[PDB]
Motif scaffolding. Structure first.
Motif, PDB file in Angstrom:
ATOM      1  N   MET A  12      12.398  35.872  -0.354  1.00 54.94           N
ATOM      2  CA  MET A  12      13.017  34.624  -0.660  1.00 54.94           C
ATOM      3  C   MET A  12      12.307  33.752  -2.101  1.00 54.94           C
ATOM      4  N   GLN A  13      12.906  32.876  -2.216  1.00 56.86           N
ATOM      5  CA  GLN A  13      12.850  32.102  -3.376  1.00 56.86           C
ATOM      6  C   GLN A  13      11.787  30.949  -2.964  1.00 56.86           C
ATOM      7  N   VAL A  14      10.843  30.801  -1.849  1.00 55.25           N
ATOM      8  CA  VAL A  14       9.869  29.743  -1.677  1.00 55.25           C
ATOM      9  C   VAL A  14       8.753  29.608  -3.051  1.00 55.25           C
ATOM     10  N   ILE A  15       8.442  28.312  -2.945  1.00 56.82           N
ATOM     11  CA  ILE A  15       7.691  28.072  -3.907  1.00 56.82           C
ATOM     12  C   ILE A  15       6.196  27.739  -3.389  1.00 56.82           C
ATOM     13  N   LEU A  16       5.062  28.161  -3.841  1.00 61.33           N
ATOM     14  CA  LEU A  16       3.804  27.946  -3.381  1.00 61.33           C
ATOM     15  C   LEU A  16       3.277  26.836  -3.737  1.00 61.33           C
ATOM     16  N   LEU A  17       2.207  26.297  -2.889  1.00 58.93           N
ATOM     17  CA  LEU A  17       1.359  25.092  -3.067  1.00 58.93           C
ATOM     18  C   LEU A  17       0.062  25.217  -3.421  1.00 58.93           C
ATOM     19  N   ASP A  18      -0.699  26.014  -2.364  1.00 65.04           N
ATOM     20  CA  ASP A  18      -1.916  26.045  -2.437  1.00 65.04           C
ATOM     21  C   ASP A  18      -2.601  27.303  -3.207  1.00 65.04           C
ATOM     22  N   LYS A  19      -4.167  27.625  -3.087  1.00 60.50           N
ATOM     23  CA  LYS A  19      -4.509  28.799  -3.766  1.00 60.50           C
ATOM     24  C   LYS A  19      -4.072  29.991  -3.242  1.00 60.50           C
ATOM     25  N   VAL A  20      -2.993  30.360  -3.138  1.00 60.95           N
ATOM     26  CA  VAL A  20      -2.634  31.693  -2.551  1.00 60.95           C
ATOM     27  C   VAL A  20      -2.965  32.859  -3.336  1.00 60.95           C
ATOM     28  N   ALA A  21      -3.476  33.979  -2.854  1.00 63.15           N
ATOM     29  CA  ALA A  21      -4.012  35.234  -3.491  1.00 63.15           C
ATOM     30  C   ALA A  21      -2.784  35.869  -4.267  1.00 63.15           C
ATOM     31  N   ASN A  22      -3.083  37.004  -5.086  1.00 61.30           N
ATOM     32  CA  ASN A  22      -2.218  37.779  -5.784  1.00 61.30           C
ATOM     33  C   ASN A  22      -0.778  37.988  -5.240  1.00 61.30           C
ATOM     34  N   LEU A  23       0.147  37.801  -6.273  1.00 60.82           N
ATOM     35  CA  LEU A  23       1.320  37.239  -6.267  1.00 60.82           C
ATOM     36  C   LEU A  23       1.393  35.567  -6.368  1.00 60.82           C
ATOM     37  N   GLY A  24       0.060  35.028  -6.589  1.00 61.61           N
ATOM     38  CA  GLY A  24      -0.186  33.776  -6.573  1.00 61.61           C
ATOM     39  C   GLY A  24       0.477  33.153  -7.923  1.00 61.61           C
ATOM     40  N   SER A  25       1.187  31.837  -7.660  1.00 64.09           N
ATOM     41  CA  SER A  25       1.903  31.383  -8.873  1.00 64.09           C
ATOM     42  C   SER A  25       1.515  29.773  -9.077  1.00 64.09           C
ATOM     43  N   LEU A  26       0.849  29.281  -8.157  1.00 62.91           N
ATOM     44  CA  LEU A  26       0.581  27.849  -8.094  1.00 62.91           C
ATOM     45  C   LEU A  26       1.862  26.935  -8.478  1.00 62.91           C
ATOM     46  N   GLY A  27       2.839  27.278  -7.875  1.00 57.51           N
ATOM     47  CA  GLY A  27       4.120  26.443  -8.015  1.00 57.51           C
ATOM     48  C   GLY A  27       5.166  27.201  -9.039  1.00 57.51           C
ATOM     49  N   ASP A  28       6.117  28.155  -8.358  1.00 60.07           N
ATOM     50  CA  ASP A  28       6.983  28.672  -9.240  1.00 60.07           C
ATOM     51  C   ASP A  28       7.865  29.207  -8.224  1.00 60.07           C
ATOM     52  N   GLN A  29       9.094  29.851  -8.577  1.00 58.62           N
ATOM     53  CA  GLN A  29       9.879  30.628  -7.905  1.00 58.62           C
ATOM     54  C   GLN A  29       9.743  32.089  -8.042  1.00 58.62           C
ATOM     55  N   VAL A  30       9.162  32.706  -7.044  1.00 58.78           N
ATOM     56  CA  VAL A  30       8.899  34.142  -7.041  1.00 58.78           C
ATOM     57  C   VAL A  30       9.681  34.686  -5.709  1.00 58.78           C
ATOM     58  N   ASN A  31       9.868  35.972  -6.081  1.00 53.99           N
ATOM     59  CA  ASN A  31      10.558  36.867  -4.848  1.00 53.99           C
ATOM     60  C   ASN A  31       9.210  37.302  -3.954  1.00 53.99           C
ATOM     61  N   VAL A  32       9.897  37.306  -2.448  1.00 51.67           N
ATOM     62  CA  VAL A  32       8.781  37.597  -1.519  1.00 51.67           C
ATOM     63  C   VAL A  32       9.599  38.419  -0.557  1.00 51.67           C
ATOM     64  N   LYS A  33       9.040  38.811   0.194  1.00 45.42           N
ATOM     65  CA  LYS A  33       9.784  39.524   1.582  1.00 45.42           C
ATOM     66  C   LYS A  33      10.016  38.579   2.772  1.00 45.42           C
ATOM     67  N   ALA A  34      10.716  38.662   3.612  1.00 44.56           N
ATOM     68  CA  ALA A  34      11.160  37.433   4.816  1.00 44.56           C
ATOM     69  C   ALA A  34      10.061  37.518   5.580  1.00 44.56           C
ATOM     70  N   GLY A  35       9.395  38.673   5.798  1.00 43.97           N
ATOM     71  CA  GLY A  35       8.236  38.645   7.017  1.00 43.97           C
ATOM     72  C   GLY A  35       7.078  37.741   6.626  1.00 43.97           C
ATOM     73  N   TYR A  36       6.905  37.786   5.355  1.00 47.20           N
ATOM     74  CA  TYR A  36       5.395  37.240   4.836  1.00 47.20           C
ATOM     75  C   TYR A  36       6.097  35.552   4.487  1.00 47.20           C
ATOM     76  N   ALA A  37       7.310  35.202   4.482  1.00 50.25           N
ATOM     77  CA  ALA A  37       7.514  34.066   4.055  1.00 50.25           C
ATOM     78  C   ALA A  37       7.454  33.142   5.367  1.00 50.25           C
ATOM     79  N   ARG A  38       8.085  33.345   6.384  1.00 52.74           N
ATOM     80  CA  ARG A  38       8.009  32.752   7.370  1.00 52.74           C
ATOM     81  C   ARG A  38       6.729  33.093   8.245  1.00 52.74           C
TER      82      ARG A  38
END
Lengths: 50, 77
Positions: free
Chosen positions: A1-27
């Motif tokens: 889904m289109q969650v927006i990252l905040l912190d220093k997430v690893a690869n698929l890292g956006s630092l604040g952007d709308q990216v696609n991700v699976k629902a199991g890793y979102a929640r």
RNA sequence: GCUUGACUGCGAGCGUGACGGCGCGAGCAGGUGCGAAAGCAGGUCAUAGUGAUCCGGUGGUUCUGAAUGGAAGGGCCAUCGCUCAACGGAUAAAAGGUACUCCGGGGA
RNA sequence: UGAGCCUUGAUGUGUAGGAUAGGUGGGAGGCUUUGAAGUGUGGACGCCAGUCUGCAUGGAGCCGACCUUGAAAUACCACCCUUUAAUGUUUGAUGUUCUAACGUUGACCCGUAAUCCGGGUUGCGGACAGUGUCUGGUGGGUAGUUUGACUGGGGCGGUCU
RNA sequence: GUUUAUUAAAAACACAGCACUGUGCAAACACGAAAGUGGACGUAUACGGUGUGACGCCUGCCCGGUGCCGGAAGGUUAAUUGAUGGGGUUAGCGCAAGCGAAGCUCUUGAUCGAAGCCCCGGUAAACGGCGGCCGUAACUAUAACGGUCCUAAGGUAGCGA
RNA sequence: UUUUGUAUAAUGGGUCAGCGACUUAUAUUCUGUAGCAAGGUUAACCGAAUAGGGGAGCCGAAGGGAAACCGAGUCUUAACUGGGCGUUAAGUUGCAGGGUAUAGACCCGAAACCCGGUGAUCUAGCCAUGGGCAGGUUGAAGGUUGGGUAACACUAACUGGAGGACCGAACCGACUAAUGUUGAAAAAUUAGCGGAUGACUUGUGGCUGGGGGUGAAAGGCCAAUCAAACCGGGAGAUAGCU
RNA sequence: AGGGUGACAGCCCCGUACACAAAAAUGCACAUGCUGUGAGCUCGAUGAGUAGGGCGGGACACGUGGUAUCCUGUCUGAAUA
RNA sequence: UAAGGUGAUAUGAACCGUUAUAACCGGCGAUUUCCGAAUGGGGAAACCCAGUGUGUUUCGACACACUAUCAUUAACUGAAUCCAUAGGUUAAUGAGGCGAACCGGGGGAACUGAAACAUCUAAGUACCCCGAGGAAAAGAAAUCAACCGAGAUUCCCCCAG
């Protein structure tokens, strides 16, 4: 889904952007315990100035 | 009971229909799973017996919106 | 020897069955073949070589077309799939045991 | 590792022939001294025919109907195809590792002098197991039934049109 | 010892022993929509199912058939994926005959696709099977023996008239 | 009454009295009768409530054809000398009756199926707590001593009391025979018989419920019943049978 | 109307037709008061895991049939006068 | 309202009353033991066993009153874990149970019919369970109609077998 990252997430890292991700890793990793936020057009407008 | 707490899906009955169309009674069981949720307003692990569809309703409405609906219609968690 | 009458729409009247059905039929209307012609040919010397209905398949026919114009589907016509052999076919689909026997009727 | 996909470059010997011609288009000038033809090597393709190219030698040109060819240009620009190679996106397969779902009939703490259960910590597993929907196989474990009629009694034999 | 209360007390049933198979514990299995209990507060010298039935001598032959346990290339094969092709509809083009874009809809179902089955090997204290035809020893009978029958193989030991 | 057929030795009745079996509703057809007539007639409802009002609608005078459609004609066919079906005969509404359809449908009668409940006070198996087994024999392991053996093994005495041990009461069973067979008893009595210190027996209370329980396995038991208990309900199940 | 009174009663008796009566409680009407609920006008807004779809069922007379509409256990998933 | 009256089988005995306090009828009240939703704990229903507060010209022993569960609200407190929550206590309000039909919703057969029987029919009937009222349910159009319209739901008669 289109969650927006905040912190220093690893690869698929956006630092604040709308990216696609699976629902199991979102929640339960990106939603609670943090480092992301849902995109229901109330959160992303309040966190626009952040 | 096997009633979903968010949506309210109850097990309803159905029929086996084979090649010879012989009727045999059966029931429709939902896909229920006990999933643990952390809330932000109360800061507590809130366990809920939800369906596979009822987990998707939490993904759109939010965990704080569903618990406000459970307070309104009388159910507890 | 030559050809396709093993032809299409009909048929007065009659035989035969409870009925469904089956069998014969001159002649007429249309269009052909043979024979010079009168005429004959609606399969074979006759009597056996068979299966209702339902559900569909195919082809043809503007007949119907759930607001209208179409279409799907259905009807008509043509035609196909049943050793339904228990052959006028109870289902698309079906074998044994009862001295443990139990009811209903008649019998040594 | 199998596949799509996006750019970038190779890559094309029916046959005559200056020569290992991808197909149609725009198209008689583009490019080169911000250093080119034309030779000499390495890497490298291959039906070892020949060509691409870094570097270097070389220091001012290749090209165009060129006459040939069924079809004419690495003069250039566009959609790209055939084959093939690399990076990169994306979808699956196989395999390893990890934790946050989940399981815990492991320990411990609290409600609570409580073998239930719930909350909390920790340990071992771990996206398996298990469950729901869909689906193939198995299944007298169980349930509803079928299992014909004439007939020197019935059954066997035999018959049914 | 046990049983057909109320026709059958037995040759039946049970029995210790033996043998096979299942089962690593949150066991198999059983009762239960489930929870959970039983199995068990036990742990392969244990538990569940089947089979024979003290003890002694012993328990031969056949894995085709039917089950079970594996192995595994190929063949077929459900759910799912919906490639191509066909048909309906019509903006428009066509004096019309007819064809037809996109969109939507209908139909066909190329490909992906596990077990099972086909196939191969074990298992007889698993279910079962353990044959016909001829020839041949004394008085007869029998067949140690000598052929055929390709069904997977033809009664050993012990006995029985 | 059933039958080809009965005094039949085919079935049924002890008698008397009472009770007991072709109905009702809604549809349709035929006949009788009555009203009206190419028309007849309302249902619900309103209502001064058997009146009156209401003509929604049904039936009939027109059919042919699959249908479009055509029409006293029409369809089949290219078209019919024709043919098939019709046209040149009054129906309709009440009432009564004879039939059919659907309802229990003239009445009486199954064995059985399913759902909802009730019972382990009888019996089968188990769980917890208690009790009973007179008397008399057989003499195991072990203990001690002696003989014996190179020493053990082995043997002879006493002690010892093991036993799904023997005999035999209570008790628990029920093998044979007799009486009994509308019995004293819906399984007993008399006399023989088997176990009787155990796989025993028994008091009290609890648990397991019907397509289930339980069963040292008979298809036995589960309230004098068991090839699926009992009672209520579907239920007036159905019967081509008497 | 009906019943009773020693046999069958308009005139014997209880009643019937008719005409009246409520201290207290209570039903229903209008009338008034109080506490609350909330008119009207203009400007908006228009109900998302929802409609629809695959598979598997159920319900509408309609049994998957060419089968609409409605309901949904499972899997997905819009548009915004 | 009244000269009679003390229910009846049922007399008898003993009284009351006759002009307003006999009896009878109606409205408004009081009393209401024990069991039964039974609610202080339990229970082999009509019985057993308590706790708290309060009362004795006899302060031993009794009497008066309260004490079930659950939902909601408020107040006071309060873990693992510091804050918080779970949890605990008290108070106010309300619910529990019974009852014949009708109604709504959740489960749901079989006999039988098809001259058997499986699709079907029987039938969403019987039964079971939950919940509500004097009616319930339904109900103001994402409905029918067909180029003309009608304007929520429910019920009756036709359409129509």
């Amino acid at each position: 889904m289109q969650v927006i990252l905040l912190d220093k997430v690893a690869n698929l890292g956006s630092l604040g952007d709308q990216v696609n991700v699976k629902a199991g890793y979102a929640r339960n990793f990106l939603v609670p315990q943090g480092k992301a936020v849902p995109a229901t057009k109330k959160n992303i407008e309040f966190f626009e100035a952040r | 009971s096997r009633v979903c707490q968010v949506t309210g899906k109850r097990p309803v009955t159905g029929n086996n229909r084979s090649h010879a169309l012989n009727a045999t009674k059966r029931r429709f069981l939902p896909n229920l799973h006990s999933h643990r949720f952390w809330v932000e307003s109360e800061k507590r692990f809130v366990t809920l017996r939800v369906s596979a569809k009822g987990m998707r309703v939490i993904d759109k409405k939010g965990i704080d919106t569903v618990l406000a609906e459970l307070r309104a219609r009388g159910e507890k968690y």
